[PDB]
Amino acid sequence: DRYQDCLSECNSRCTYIPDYAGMRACIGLCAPACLTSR
User: Fold this and answer.
1) What angle do CA 10, 14, 3 make, to 5 degrees?
2) d(CA 13, CA 15)
């Protein structure tokens, strides 16, 4: 589903973030925004 795909690439995309806080927040908000925007 578009949800799994988006989240997948999204996570693996923001996974490059060295900061644990920035990474968790980025991926944590990326999904919600993606689902609400998609």
Assistant:
1) 15
2) 5
**Residue appearing with tokens 């799994």:** 4
Burial class (CB in 10 A: 0-12, 13-18, 19+), 30: middle
Under a CB-based contact definition with an 8 Å cutoff, are residues 3 and 10 in contact?
A: no
What span, in angstroms and rounded, lies between the C-alpha atoms of 33 and 29?
A: 6
Sign of CA dihedral 3, 8, 10, 14: positive
Q: Which two tokens stand for residue 2?
A: 């578009």
Q: What is the maximal distance between C-alpha atoms in the chain? A: 29
Structure obtained using:
NMR
